[PDB]
A paper describes a structure:
The overall structure of TlGK in both states (apo-enzyme and ternary complex) shows the same two domains organization described previously; the large domain harbors a Rossmann fold (α/β/α) architecture with a central twelve stranded β-sheet surrounded by thirteen α-helices and three 310 helices, and the small inserted domain consisting of five β-strands and four α-helices. When the enzyme is in ligand-free state (apo), the large and small domains are distant from each other and accordingly there are no discernible interactions between residues from either domain. The distance between the two side-chain groups is reduced from 12.0 Å in the apo-enzyme to only 3.4 Å in the ternary complex (cluster 2). Cluster 5 is defined by interactions between residues Lys74 and Lys246 located in the small and large domain, respectively. In the apo-enzyme the distance between amine groups is >8.7 Å, whereas in the ternary complex this distance decrease to 4.0 Å, close enough to establish a repulsive interaction between the side chains of these Lys residues.
One of these major differences is the presence of ADP-dependent glucokinases (GKs) and phosphofructokinases (PFKs), instead of the classical ATP-dependent kinases. In addition to this core ribokinase-like fold; other members of this superfamily have an extra small domain, which in the case of the ADP-dependent kinases is formed by a five stranded β-sheet with some α-helical insertions, the active site lying between the two domains. These patterns of inhibition are consistent with an ordered sequential mechanism in which Mg·ADP is the first substrate to bind to the catalytic site and Mg·AMP the last product to be released.
Author numbering: 1 to 467
The structure:
Amino acid sequence: MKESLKDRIRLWKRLYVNAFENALNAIPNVKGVLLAYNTNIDAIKYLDKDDLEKRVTEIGKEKVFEIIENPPEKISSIEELLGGILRSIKLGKAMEWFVESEEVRRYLREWGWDELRIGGQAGIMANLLGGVYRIPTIVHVPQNPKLQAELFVDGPIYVPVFEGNKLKLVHPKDAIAEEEELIHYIYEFPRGFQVFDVQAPRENRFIANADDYNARVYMRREFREGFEEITRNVELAIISGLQVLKEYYPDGTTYRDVLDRVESHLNILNRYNVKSHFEFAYTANRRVREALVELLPKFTSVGLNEVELASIMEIIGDEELAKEVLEGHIFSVIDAMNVLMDETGIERIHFHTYGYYLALTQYRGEEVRDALLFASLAAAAKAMKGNLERIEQIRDALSVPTNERAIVLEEELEKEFTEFENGLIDMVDRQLAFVPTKIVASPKSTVGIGDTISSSAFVSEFGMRKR
């Protein structure tokens, strides 16, 4: 007879338990992951009403409110900084503007922060894969002054240093350098935060970006001259941070100054049979977005969400498919994943959205689904606790109810794409895996989650499949 809704609920609970056990057994098999390129410092301030109003008044209230109506491209004055914050509160929208002015950068440091944590997709994933999962990790740190180095947690996290010719791997706190602090000031505000007449529709953040190095992808000399020797020490690589690249720069350089070098790294990784996963974050420039699609055949794997997959369909699908993917309509998402895998021949695509994940793979097996389940629990644990510290904290995410609507979506999906096992579907020359996720009702954290999902699935899948 058909498995009822209450039966599929029990069945997903058992799959989640077994997948957590299998991931914990498999993860010790991973002998190294490389993470590149973006690592910075995040300085978080929880905005205060009086303090923010006083600063708007000091600088000139008429100049600030004008900036909310006509926003600039980047921050070049204190008026523009505080205009962007109030616009972010008014619209309720996640914004990030680059700080060009040295005077504003001094003003931001004096205003300060309530909390400091590692930033950047590579930097955050070093603390997760190295600190929590204990996988030996080499991370790219474009500028490593003391304030940056000491944001890394204890565990097997490593950065390359040159001893004349010989490359060594040491903890980041053992490699402090006289280098720039790359700080992103994150001004956070709750649901219905109010300042003057302006009031927030929902909770969000404005980011003031004072980081010259990750914006242009300037790489350490150890990754420029010693990449092959780094490669010899890992089995996996996760590449992120290319989404900032512009087609043209005012100094006449272009995006290929960085992408030719990235491609040279991929050539090395593939010569050593390292499996690589690209985080295809939204890339505003369409010519750069297309050059990154054309680099996908040299990756093993790609991670993307509904905005990021819709964006890629705008350049290689069609606009109507892109619209449907943006909304997370499962059959259009599948069609899009298939179009991307037909265009690139990439072996793995992991899609993640609100309620469910999909993974389309050229190879077959239950490990693909169990890695998705582990990633779901890692994400729910991070959102629950704010930041994770040990891998046993992810066990508590087993208590978070699985999203019941996505259990029902599984039926709809299965009527067209028959399953051979729960969450697992054969196609002619590929496999599709589906899991319903764990949505945390009152999350302590809303940032770093997408990377947590995408990294955790890729690394635990490899660990489980390794033979």
